[PDB]
Amino acid sequence: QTDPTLEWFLSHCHIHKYPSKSTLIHQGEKAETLYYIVKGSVAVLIKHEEGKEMILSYLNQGDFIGELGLFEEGQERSAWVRAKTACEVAEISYKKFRQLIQVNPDILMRLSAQMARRLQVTSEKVGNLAFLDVTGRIAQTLLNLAKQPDAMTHPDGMQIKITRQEIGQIVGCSRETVGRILKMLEDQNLISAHGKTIVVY
Amino acid sequence: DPTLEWFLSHCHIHKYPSKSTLIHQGEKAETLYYIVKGSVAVLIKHEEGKEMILSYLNQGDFIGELGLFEEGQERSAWVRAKTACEVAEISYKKFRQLIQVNPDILMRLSAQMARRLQVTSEKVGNLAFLDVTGRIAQTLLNLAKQPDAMTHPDGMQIKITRQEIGQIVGCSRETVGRILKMLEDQNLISAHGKTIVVYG
Ligand SMILES: Nc1ncnc2c1ncn2[C@@H]1O[C@@H]2COP(=O)(O)O[C@H]2[C@H]1O
Ligand SMILES: Nc1ncnc2c1ncn2[C@@H]1O[C@@H]2COP(=O)(O)O[C@H]2[C@H]1O
Ligand SMILES: Nc1ncnc2c1ncn2[C@@H]1O[C@@H]2COP(=O)(O)O[C@H]2[C@H]1O
């Protein structure tokens, strides 16, 4: 589902394909381009020497990406953005976009609605990490990604596909610890695990 | 600035004393704020004697902007006046009417949202990669790297309460007390009255 405005915006971009796991944005690169996911999904990650990679968020079709450096020249990509599946994404220079903004501010309103949402979601994440114990953090995380578009409904909850590695990267724990906690969450009858498939209740 | 004075002329301004609450988490959001003077703390709570300051906002900063793009939303957090403040306020409706006239007012707001997203995202990385002790240790270091930080013959000197430290890391004031002591025995810092010396 799309609309005129959106299509108007798109007719000003170049759509490029990206195989699963390929990197769309490298942290540190000069920020001079805006992106738009027409198809597929991506992960946004940050790195910290020792411990390594952490997943800030998943973004999907309809999501803008690479927008954080738009309002001030000379900024660096604040994160790594990698394809989680085959992706088709539009791109336009900040300059051309700042122009379309003047033509029709609605395009900025749509981008802004998403930034506001991201700030609400990232803030909630900040709190969960500071206030929840590792158990609650993982328990909540399973609820969140159960809210993702790729989540398949279960005749008694919601079914998701995730790795102990990904969970650990979202909550900030090792896959070993995640496994041990998933065991408890299963025992406590809160989830059902079968391979890399989890059924959240 | 012509754009900002214009923006403000359409708002109603009010004075808020210290410790005063401008925004209550959970309430329906139908209005936007703009700090003309003063400072505020944006914070979230776990009502277990543990608060977390997501950020400080100052003169020239917008507040309550998160519920502007979708109706039926609630305030994502509590905003408390740090010092006396003069805050302009305007409903989302009138603000959306100003955006049509000149989108620049929206650009300025959005630039602040992007900065805020970048800063909060950095915070996320640290909290995930740090125990309560490490969070506090790193906070003492970061506080020593700031301009207002003072010089001490042994390194840097800072002034901050156990509560304030607790609000930064999201833990109890007592937890801060115990951690600061352990850090002393580790010969990493010194604590007397309300002054903390960070060696190095
Ligand atoms: N907390 C976050 N939530 C969602 N997307 C984010 C977050 N932090 C960064 N991003 C995205 O990661 C992108 C990579 O570089 P930019 O800073 O140009 O733009 C970034 C945002 O689109
Ligand atoms: N605080 C942390 N301790 C351990 N692993 C972490 C932490 N924060 C994030 N992680 C990531 O979580 C991942 C879980 O399993 P990996 O072997 O893939 O490598 C791990 C790290 O990259
Ligand atoms: N991470 C953050 N950084 C800065 N300000 C924030 C953050 N999270 C919330 N706020 C502010 O807290 C305000 C309170 O309610 P709103 O959600 O309407 O708008 C909010 C934002 O202006």
PDB file of C-alpha atoms in Angstrom, chain A residues 46-48 50-54 56 67-72 75-76 78 98 101-102 105 108-110 112-120 122-123 125-127 129-132 137 170-173, chain B residues 44-46 50-52 54 65-70 73-74 76 96 99-100 102-104 106-108 110-118 120-129 135 169-171:
ATOM      1  CA  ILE A  46      26.267  -0.314  17.073  1.00  0.00           C
ATOM      2  CA  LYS A  47      29.659  -1.592  18.205  1.00  0.00           C
ATOM      3  CA  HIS A  48      31.741  -1.176  21.354  1.00  0.00           C
ATOM      4  CA  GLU A  50      35.062  -5.882  23.650  1.00  0.00           C
ATOM      5  CA  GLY A  51      31.587  -7.424  23.750  1.00  0.00           C
ATOM      6  CA  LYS A  52      30.901  -6.117  20.250  1.00  0.00           C
ATOM      7  CA  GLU A  53      27.675  -5.709  18.251  1.00  0.00           C
ATOM      8  CA  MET A  54      24.282  -4.726  19.666  1.00  0.00           C
ATOM      9  CA  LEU A  56      19.365  -0.983  18.290  1.00  0.00           C
ATOM     10  CA  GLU A  67      17.945  10.377   8.231  1.00  0.00           C
ATOM     11  CA  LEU A  68      19.882  11.394  11.336  1.00  0.00           C
ATOM     12  CA  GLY A  69      22.479  13.468   9.521  1.00  0.00           C
ATOM     13  CA  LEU A  70      19.928  15.286   7.352  1.00  0.00           C
ATOM     14  CA  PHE A  71      19.526  18.409   9.458  1.00  0.00           C
ATOM     15  CA  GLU A  72      23.210  19.306   9.754  1.00  0.00           C
ATOM     16  CA  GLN A  75      27.805  14.286  10.416  1.00  0.00           C
ATOM     17  CA  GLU A  76      28.697  10.612  10.578  1.00  0.00           C
ATOM     18  CA  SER A  78      25.607   6.884  13.909  1.00  0.00           C
ATOM     19  CA  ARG A  98      15.726  19.297   1.485  1.00  0.00           C
ATOM     20  CA  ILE A 101      10.681  19.430   1.618  1.00  0.00           C
ATOM     21  CA  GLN A 102      10.149  23.032   0.508  1.00  0.00           C
ATOM     22  CA  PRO A 105       6.514  19.678   3.787  1.00  0.00           C
ATOM     23  CA  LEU A 108       9.160  15.861   6.216  1.00  0.00           C
ATOM     24  CA  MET A 109       6.123  15.244   8.410  1.00  0.00           C
ATOM     25  CA  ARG A 110       6.198  11.554   7.487  1.00  0.00           C
ATOM     26  CA  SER A 112       9.443  13.127  11.437  1.00  0.00           C
ATOM     27  CA  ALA A 113       6.640  10.848  12.635  1.00  0.00           C
ATOM     28  CA  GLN A 114       9.074   7.945  12.349  1.00  0.00           C
ATOM     29  CA  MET A 115      11.862   9.747  14.186  1.00  0.00           C
ATOM     30  CA  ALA A 116       9.454  10.540  17.009  1.00  0.00           C
ATOM     31  CA  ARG A 117       8.456   6.879  17.193  1.00  0.00           C
ATOM     32  CA  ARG A 118      12.091   5.779  17.176  1.00  0.00           C
ATOM     33  CA  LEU A 119      12.816   8.102  20.084  1.00  0.00           C
ATOM     34  CA  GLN A 120       9.847   6.715  22.050  1.00  0.00           C
ATOM     35  CA  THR A 122      14.635   3.726  22.028  1.00  0.00           C
ATOM     36  CA  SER A 123      13.786   5.547  25.250  1.00  0.00           C
ATOM     37  CA  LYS A 125      14.671   0.446  25.609  1.00  0.00           C
ATOM     38  CA  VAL A 126      16.915   2.687  27.726  1.00  0.00           C
ATOM     39  CA  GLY A 127      14.580   2.195  30.676  1.00  0.00           C
ATOM     40  CA  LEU A 129      18.015  -1.963  30.261  1.00  0.00           C
ATOM     41  CA  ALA A 130      18.436   0.143  33.398  1.00  0.00           C
ATOM     42  CA  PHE A 131      15.425  -1.154  35.309  1.00  0.00           C
ATOM     43  CA  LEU A 132      14.884  -4.762  34.261  1.00  0.00           C
ATOM     44  CA  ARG A 137      14.799  -7.738  29.566  1.00  0.00           C
ATOM     45  CA  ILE A 170      19.339  -7.002  21.631  1.00  0.00           C
ATOM     46  CA  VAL A 171      19.385  -7.408  25.417  1.00  0.00           C
ATOM     47  CA  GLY A 172      23.164  -7.294  25.763  1.00  0.00           C
ATOM     48  CA  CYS A 173      23.981 -10.844  26.883  1.00  0.00           C
TER      49      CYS A 173
ATOM     50  CA  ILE B  44      11.316   7.887  33.486  1.00  0.00           C
ATOM     51  CA  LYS B  45      10.454   6.009  36.668  1.00  0.00           C
ATOM     52  CA  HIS B  46      10.172   2.475  38.018  1.00  0.00           C
ATOM     53  CA  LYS B  50      14.634   4.512  41.113  1.00  0.00           C
ATOM     54  CA  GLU B  51      14.443   7.215  38.462  1.00  0.00           C
ATOM     55  CA  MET B  52      16.447   7.619  35.268  1.00  0.00           C
ATOM     56  CA  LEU B  54      16.918  10.404  29.839  1.00  0.00           C
ATOM     57  CA  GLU B  65       6.993  16.869  20.567  1.00  0.00           C
ATOM     58  CA  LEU B  66       6.616  13.053  20.492  1.00  0.00           C
ATOM     59  CA  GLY B  67       2.829  12.958  20.378  1.00  0.00           C
ATOM     60  CA  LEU B  68       2.552  15.469  17.531  1.00  0.00           C
ATOM     61  CA  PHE B  69       2.421  13.133  14.525  1.00  0.00           C
ATOM     62  CA  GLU B  70      -0.310  10.756  15.741  1.00  0.00           C
ATOM     63  CA  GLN B  73      -0.792   9.295  22.224  1.00  0.00           C
ATOM     64  CA  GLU B  74       0.510   9.722  25.741  1.00  0.00           C
ATOM     65  CA  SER B  76       6.475   9.165  26.959  1.00  0.00           C
ATOM     66  CA  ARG B  96       0.363  22.084  12.455  1.00  0.00           C
ATOM     67  CA  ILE B  99       3.953  24.338   9.718  1.00  0.00           C
ATOM     68  CA  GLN B 100       1.896  24.965   6.572  1.00  0.00           C
ATOM     69  CA  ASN B 102       6.537  27.877   7.021  1.00  0.00           C
ATOM     70  CA  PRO B 103       7.978  24.315   7.324  1.00  0.00           C
ATOM     71  CA  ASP B 104      11.201  25.696   8.775  1.00  0.00           C
ATOM     72  CA  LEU B 106       9.295  21.765  11.623  1.00  0.00           C
ATOM     73  CA  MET B 107      12.887  21.421  10.422  1.00  0.00           C
ATOM     74  CA  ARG B 108      14.193  22.894  13.694  1.00  0.00           C
ATOM     75  CA  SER B 110      13.164  17.543  13.642  1.00  0.00           C
ATOM     76  CA  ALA B 111      16.816  18.447  13.947  1.00  0.00           C
ATOM     77  CA  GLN B 112      16.371  18.203  17.701  1.00  0.00           C
ATOM     78  CA  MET B 113      14.663  14.820  17.420  1.00  0.00           C
ATOM     79  CA  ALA B 114      17.522  13.420  15.331  1.00  0.00           C
ATOM     80  CA  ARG B 115      20.106  14.705  17.837  1.00  0.00           C
ATOM     81  CA  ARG B 116      18.079  13.241  20.663  1.00  0.00           C
ATOM     82  CA  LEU B 117      17.837   9.879  18.891  1.00  0.00           C
ATOM     83  CA  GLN B 118      21.620   9.803  18.360  1.00  0.00           C
ATOM     84  CA  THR B 120      19.802   8.194  23.486  1.00  0.00           C
ATOM     85  CA  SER B 121      21.083   5.458  21.156  1.00  0.00           C
ATOM     86  CA  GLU B 122      24.584   5.962  22.577  1.00  0.00           C
ATOM     87  CA  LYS B 123      23.116   5.600  26.047  1.00  0.00           C
ATOM     88  CA  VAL B 124      21.561   2.275  25.003  1.00  0.00           C
ATOM     89  CA  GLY B 125      24.947   0.885  24.020  1.00  0.00           C
ATOM     90  CA  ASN B 126      26.467   1.722  27.403  1.00  0.00           C
ATOM     91  CA  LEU B 127      23.669   0.400  29.617  1.00  0.00           C
ATOM     92  CA  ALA B 128      23.665  -2.948  27.823  1.00  0.00           C
ATOM     93  CA  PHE B 129      27.453  -3.210  28.112  1.00  0.00           C
ATOM     94  CA  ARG B 135      27.745   2.220  34.798  1.00  0.00           C
ATOM     95  CA  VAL B 169      22.489   5.279  36.036  1.00  0.00           C
ATOM     96  CA  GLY B 170      18.931   4.467  37.061  1.00  0.00           C
ATOM     97  CA  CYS B 171      19.717   2.920  40.431  1.00  0.00           C
TER      98      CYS B 171
END
